[PDB]
Short mmCIF file of C-alpha atoms and ligand atoms in Angstrom, two decimals:
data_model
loop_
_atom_site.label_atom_id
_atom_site.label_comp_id
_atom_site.label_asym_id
_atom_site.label_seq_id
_atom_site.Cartn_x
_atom_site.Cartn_y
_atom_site.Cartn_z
CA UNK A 1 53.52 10.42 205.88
CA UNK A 2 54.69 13.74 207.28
CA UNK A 3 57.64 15.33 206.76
CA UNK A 4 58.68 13.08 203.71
CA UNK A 5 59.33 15.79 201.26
CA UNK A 6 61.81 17.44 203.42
CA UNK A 7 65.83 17.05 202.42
CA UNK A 8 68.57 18.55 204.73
CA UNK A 9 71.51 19.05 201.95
CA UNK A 10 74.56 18.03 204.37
CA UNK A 11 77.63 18.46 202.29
CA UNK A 12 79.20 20.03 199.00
CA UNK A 13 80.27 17.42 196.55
CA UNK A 14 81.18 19.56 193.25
CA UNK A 15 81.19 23.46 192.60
CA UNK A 16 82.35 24.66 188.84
CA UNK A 17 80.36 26.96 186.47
CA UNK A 18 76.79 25.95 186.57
CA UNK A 19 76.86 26.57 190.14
CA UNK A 20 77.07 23.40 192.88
CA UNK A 21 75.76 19.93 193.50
CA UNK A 22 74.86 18.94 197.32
CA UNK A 23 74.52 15.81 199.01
CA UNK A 24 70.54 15.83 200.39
CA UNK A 25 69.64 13.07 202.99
CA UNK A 26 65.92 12.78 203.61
CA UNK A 27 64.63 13.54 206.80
CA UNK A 28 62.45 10.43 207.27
CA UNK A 29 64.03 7.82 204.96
CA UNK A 30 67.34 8.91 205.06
CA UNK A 31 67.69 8.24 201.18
CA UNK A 32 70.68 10.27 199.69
CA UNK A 33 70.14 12.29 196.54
CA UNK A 34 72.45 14.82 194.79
CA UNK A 35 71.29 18.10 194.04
CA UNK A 36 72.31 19.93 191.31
CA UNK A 37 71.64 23.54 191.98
CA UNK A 38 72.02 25.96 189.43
CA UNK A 39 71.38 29.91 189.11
CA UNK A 40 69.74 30.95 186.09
CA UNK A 41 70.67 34.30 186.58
CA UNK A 42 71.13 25.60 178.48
CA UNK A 43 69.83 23.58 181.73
CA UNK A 44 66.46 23.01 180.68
CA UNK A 45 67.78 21.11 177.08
CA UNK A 46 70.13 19.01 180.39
CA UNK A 47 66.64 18.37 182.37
CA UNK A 48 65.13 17.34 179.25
CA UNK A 49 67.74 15.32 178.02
CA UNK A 50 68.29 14.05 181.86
CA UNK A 51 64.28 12.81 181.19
CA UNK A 52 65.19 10.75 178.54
CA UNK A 53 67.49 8.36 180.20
CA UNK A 54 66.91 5.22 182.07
CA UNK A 55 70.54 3.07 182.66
CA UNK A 56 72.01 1.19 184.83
CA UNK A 57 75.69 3.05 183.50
CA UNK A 58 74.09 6.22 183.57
CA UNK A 59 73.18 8.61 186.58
CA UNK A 60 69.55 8.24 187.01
CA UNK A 61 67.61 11.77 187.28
CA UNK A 62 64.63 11.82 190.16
CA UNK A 63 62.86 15.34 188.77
CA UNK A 64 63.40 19.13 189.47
CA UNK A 65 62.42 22.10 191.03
CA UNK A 66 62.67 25.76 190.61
CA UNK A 67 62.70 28.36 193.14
CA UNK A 68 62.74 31.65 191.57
CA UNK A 69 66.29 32.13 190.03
CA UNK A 70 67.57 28.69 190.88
CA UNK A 71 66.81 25.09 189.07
CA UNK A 72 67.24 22.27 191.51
CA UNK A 73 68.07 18.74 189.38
CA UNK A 74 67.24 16.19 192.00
CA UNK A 75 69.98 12.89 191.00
CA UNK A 76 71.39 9.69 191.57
CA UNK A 77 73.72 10.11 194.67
CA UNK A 78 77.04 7.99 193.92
CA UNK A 79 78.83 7.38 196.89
CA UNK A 80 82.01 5.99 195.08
CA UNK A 81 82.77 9.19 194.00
CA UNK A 82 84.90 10.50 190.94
CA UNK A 83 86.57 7.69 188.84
CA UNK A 84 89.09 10.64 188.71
CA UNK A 85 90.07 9.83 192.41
CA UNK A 86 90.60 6.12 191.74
CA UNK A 87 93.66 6.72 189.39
CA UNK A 88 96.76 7.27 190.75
CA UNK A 89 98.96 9.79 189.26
CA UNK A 90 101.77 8.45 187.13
CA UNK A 91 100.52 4.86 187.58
CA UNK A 92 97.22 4.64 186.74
CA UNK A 93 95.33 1.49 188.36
CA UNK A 94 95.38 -2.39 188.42
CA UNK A 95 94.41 -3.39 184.85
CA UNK A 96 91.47 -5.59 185.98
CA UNK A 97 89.76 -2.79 187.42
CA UNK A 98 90.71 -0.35 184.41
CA UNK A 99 88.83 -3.48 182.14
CA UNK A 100 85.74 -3.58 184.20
CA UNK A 101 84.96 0.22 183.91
CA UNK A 102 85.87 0.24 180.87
CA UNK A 103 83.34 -2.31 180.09
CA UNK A 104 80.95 -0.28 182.42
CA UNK A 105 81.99 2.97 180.58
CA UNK A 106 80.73 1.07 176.99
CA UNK A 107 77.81 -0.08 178.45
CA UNK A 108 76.43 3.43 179.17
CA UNK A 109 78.15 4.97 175.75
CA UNK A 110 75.98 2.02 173.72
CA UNK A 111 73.02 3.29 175.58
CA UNK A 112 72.94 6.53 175.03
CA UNK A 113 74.16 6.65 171.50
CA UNK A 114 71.12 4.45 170.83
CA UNK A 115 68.56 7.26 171.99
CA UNK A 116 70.76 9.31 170.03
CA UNK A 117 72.46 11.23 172.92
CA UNK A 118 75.97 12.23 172.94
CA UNK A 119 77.51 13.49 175.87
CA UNK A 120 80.77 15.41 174.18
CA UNK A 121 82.36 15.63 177.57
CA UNK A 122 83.64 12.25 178.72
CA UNK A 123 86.28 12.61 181.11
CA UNK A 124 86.97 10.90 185.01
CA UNK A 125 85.88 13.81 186.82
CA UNK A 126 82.27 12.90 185.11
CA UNK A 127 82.33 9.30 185.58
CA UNK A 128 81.10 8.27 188.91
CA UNK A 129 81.36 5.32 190.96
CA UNK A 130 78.51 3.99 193.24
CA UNK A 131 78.13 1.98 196.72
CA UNK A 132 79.68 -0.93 194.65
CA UNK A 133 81.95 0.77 192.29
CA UNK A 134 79.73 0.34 189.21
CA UNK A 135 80.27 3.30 187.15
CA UNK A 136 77.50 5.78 186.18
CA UNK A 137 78.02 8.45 183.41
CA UNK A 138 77.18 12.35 184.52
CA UNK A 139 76.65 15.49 183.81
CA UNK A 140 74.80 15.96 180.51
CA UNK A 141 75.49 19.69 180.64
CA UNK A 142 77.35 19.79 177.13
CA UNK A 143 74.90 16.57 176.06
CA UNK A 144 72.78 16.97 172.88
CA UNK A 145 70.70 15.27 170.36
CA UNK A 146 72.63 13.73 167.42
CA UNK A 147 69.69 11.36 166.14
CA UNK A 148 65.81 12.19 165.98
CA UNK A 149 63.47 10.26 163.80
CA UNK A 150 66.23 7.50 162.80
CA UNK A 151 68.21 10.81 160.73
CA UNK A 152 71.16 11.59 162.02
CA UNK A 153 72.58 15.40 162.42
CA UNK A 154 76.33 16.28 162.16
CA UNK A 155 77.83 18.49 164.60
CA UNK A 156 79.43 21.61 164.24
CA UNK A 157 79.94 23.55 168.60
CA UNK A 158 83.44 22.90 169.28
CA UNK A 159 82.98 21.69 173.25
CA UNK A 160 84.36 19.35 175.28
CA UNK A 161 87.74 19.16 177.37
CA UNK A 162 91.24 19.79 175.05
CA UNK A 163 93.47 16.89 176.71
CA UNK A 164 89.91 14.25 175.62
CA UNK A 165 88.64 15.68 172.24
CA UNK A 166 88.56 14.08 169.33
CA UNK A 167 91.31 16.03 166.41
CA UNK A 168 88.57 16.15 163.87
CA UNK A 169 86.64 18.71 166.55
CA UNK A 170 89.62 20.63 166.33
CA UNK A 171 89.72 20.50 162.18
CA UNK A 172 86.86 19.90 160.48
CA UNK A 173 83.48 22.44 160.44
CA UNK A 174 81.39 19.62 160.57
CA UNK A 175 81.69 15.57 162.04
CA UNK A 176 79.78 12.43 163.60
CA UNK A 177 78.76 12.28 167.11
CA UNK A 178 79.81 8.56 168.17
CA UNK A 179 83.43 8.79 166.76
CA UNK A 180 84.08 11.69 169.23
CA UNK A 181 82.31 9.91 172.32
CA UNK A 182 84.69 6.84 171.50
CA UNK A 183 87.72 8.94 171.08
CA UNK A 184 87.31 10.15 174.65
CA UNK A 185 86.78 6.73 176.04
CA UNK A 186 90.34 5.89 174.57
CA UNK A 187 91.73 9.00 176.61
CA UNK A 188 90.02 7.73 179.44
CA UNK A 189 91.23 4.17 179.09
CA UNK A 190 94.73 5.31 178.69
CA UNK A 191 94.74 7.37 181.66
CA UNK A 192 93.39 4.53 183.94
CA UNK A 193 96.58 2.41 182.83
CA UNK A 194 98.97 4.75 182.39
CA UNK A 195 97.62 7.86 185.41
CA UNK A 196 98.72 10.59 183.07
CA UNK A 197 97.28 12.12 179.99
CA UNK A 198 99.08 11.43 176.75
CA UNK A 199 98.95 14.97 175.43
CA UNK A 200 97.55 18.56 175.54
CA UNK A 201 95.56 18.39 172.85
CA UNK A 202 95.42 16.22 169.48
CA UNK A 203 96.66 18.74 166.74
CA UNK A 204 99.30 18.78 164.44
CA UNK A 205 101.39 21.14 166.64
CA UNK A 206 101.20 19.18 169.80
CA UNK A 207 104.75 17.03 169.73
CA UNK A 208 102.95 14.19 171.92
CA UNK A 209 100.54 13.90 169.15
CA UNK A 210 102.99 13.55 166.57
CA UNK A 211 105.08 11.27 168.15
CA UNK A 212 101.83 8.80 168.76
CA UNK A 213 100.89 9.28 164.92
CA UNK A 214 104.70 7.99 164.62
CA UNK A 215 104.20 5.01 166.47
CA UNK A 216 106.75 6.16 169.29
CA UNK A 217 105.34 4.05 171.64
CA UNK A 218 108.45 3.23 173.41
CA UNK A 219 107.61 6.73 175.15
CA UNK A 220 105.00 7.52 177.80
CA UNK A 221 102.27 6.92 178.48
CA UNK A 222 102.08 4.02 175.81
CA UNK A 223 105.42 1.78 177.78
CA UNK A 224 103.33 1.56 180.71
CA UNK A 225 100.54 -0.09 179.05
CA UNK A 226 100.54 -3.63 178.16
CA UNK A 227 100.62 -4.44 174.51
CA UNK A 228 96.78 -6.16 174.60
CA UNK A 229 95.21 -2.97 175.69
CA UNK A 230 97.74 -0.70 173.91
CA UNK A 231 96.41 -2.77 170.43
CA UNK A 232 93.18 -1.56 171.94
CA UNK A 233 94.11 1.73 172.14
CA UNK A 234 95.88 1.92 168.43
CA UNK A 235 92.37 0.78 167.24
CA UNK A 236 90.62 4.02 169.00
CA UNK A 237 93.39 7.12 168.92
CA UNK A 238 92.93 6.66 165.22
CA UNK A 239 92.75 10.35 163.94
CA UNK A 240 90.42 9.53 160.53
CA UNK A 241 87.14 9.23 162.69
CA UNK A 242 85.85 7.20 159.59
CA UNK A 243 88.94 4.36 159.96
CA UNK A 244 88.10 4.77 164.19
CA UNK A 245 86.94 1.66 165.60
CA UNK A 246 83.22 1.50 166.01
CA UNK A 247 81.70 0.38 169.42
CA UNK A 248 80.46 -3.49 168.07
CA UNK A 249 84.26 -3.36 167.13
CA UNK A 250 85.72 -2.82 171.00
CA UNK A 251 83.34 -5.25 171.71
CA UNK A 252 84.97 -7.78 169.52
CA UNK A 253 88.29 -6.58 170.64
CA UNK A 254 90.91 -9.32 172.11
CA UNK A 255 92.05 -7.35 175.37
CA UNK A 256 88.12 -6.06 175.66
CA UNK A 257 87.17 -10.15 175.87
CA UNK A 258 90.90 -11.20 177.92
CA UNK A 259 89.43 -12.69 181.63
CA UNK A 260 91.51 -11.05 184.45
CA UNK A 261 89.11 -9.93 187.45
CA UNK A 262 87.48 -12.25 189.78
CA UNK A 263 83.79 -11.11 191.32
CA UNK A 264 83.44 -8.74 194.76
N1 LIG B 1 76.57 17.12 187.12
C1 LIG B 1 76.35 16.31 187.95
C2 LIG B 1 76.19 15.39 188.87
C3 LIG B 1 77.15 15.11 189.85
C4 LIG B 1 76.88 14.08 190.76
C5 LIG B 1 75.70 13.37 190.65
C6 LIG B 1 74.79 13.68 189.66
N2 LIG B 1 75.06 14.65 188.80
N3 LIG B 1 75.70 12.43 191.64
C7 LIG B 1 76.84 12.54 192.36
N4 LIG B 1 77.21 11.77 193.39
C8 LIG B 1 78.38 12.01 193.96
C9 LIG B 1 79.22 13.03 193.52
C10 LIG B 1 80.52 13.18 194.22
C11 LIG B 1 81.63 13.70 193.52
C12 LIG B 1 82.87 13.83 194.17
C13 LIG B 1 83.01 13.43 195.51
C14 LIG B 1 84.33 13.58 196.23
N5 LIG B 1 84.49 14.93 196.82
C15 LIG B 1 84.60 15.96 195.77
C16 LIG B 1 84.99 17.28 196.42
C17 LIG B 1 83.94 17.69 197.46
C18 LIG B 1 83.70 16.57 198.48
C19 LIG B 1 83.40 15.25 197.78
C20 LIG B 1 81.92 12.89 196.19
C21 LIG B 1 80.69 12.76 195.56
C22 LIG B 1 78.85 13.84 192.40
C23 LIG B 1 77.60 13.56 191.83
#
């Protein structure tokens, strides 16, 4: 069929560091792809890591292309948007909806901690929602190998976004992946419920911080979230990554297993 491998890109739909991703729409099928286009003038260990994974809860990755100076990733179009753009500021968002991609959000975590990927940069602007608001995990830019031939590796590159990390990023040299990736799940959890971020940065010198480790949940964000998630929630912001709830654990969790949202 003529013409088939020809893509008009029709619209900008993210520009940071790496350079910009594109909406493509095929000239014959009209299929919709996103393009991430990047200037090399790092992103091969993403399109090799982007190879690896095949997930419903992740953003699938078509191939790639490179013209010179610039590496074209060729991805799973999500027409949802940014989960970012679903909560609203100061209130977050209905609790049955926060529940479902949450369970979405696990889903994709279990996945790719069992190929031994971790992402280290879970956040709302990176979680993406589709046609049918399913949620799809993105941008495996910071992503890395934590688990090769069943042994794991401990991490040491401090990365990630300050307001999600984990505290033992901030003081230990060395620490486990999956702790980390749960951590910011919790972050993301709370700001779905509560549409604010409960603090700067998880260090001894942030006051926020403190006044969670104190139980001050009286305060905000933690008295606009219901006391079956915020149980939830006491489980994951646990600052000993070693007492941190596992993932088999939120599974088994109360509020993680409470009905609330009927089907489409
Ligand atoms: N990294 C990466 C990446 C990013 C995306 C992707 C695959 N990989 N697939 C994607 N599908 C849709 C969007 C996206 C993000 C935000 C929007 C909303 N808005 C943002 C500002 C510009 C206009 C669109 C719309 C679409 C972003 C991506």
């Amino acid at each position: 069929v003529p013409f088939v491998e020809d893509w008009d890109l029709v619209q900008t739909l993210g520009e940071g560091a790496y350079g910009e991703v594109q909406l493509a729409v095929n000239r014959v099928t009209e299929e919709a792809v996103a393009v991430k286009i990047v200037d090399m003038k790092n992103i091969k260990k993403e399109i090799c890591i982007n190879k690896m994974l095949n997930h419903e809860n992740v953003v699938k990755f078509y191939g790639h292309r490179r013209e010179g100076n610039i590496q074209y990733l060729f991805l799973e179009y999500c027409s949802g948007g940014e989960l970012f753009d679903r909560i609203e500021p100061d209130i977050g968002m209905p609790e049955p909806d926060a529940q479902r991609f949450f369970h979405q959000l696990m889903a994709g975590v279990v996945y790719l901690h069992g190929i031994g990927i971790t992402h280290r940069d879970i956040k709302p602007e990176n979680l993406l929602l589709d046609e049918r608001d399913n949620l799809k995990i993105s941008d495996f830019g910071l992503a890395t190998v934590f688990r090769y031939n069943n042994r794991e590796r401990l991490l040491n590159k401090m990365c990630g976004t300050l307001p999600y990390v984990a505290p033992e990023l901030l003081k230990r040299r060395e620490f486990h992946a999956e702790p980390v990736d749960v951590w910011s799940c919790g972050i993301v959890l709370t700001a779905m419920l509560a549409g604010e971020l409960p603090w700067d940065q998880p260090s001894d010198s942030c006051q926020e911080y403190s006044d969670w480790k104190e139980k001050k949940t009286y305060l905000n964000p933690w008295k606009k979230i219901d006391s079956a998630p915020l149980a939830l929630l006491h489980k994951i912001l646990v600052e000993n990554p070693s007492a941190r709830i596992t993932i088999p654990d939120i599974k088994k969790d109360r509020w993680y297993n409470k009905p609330l949202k009927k089907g489409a």
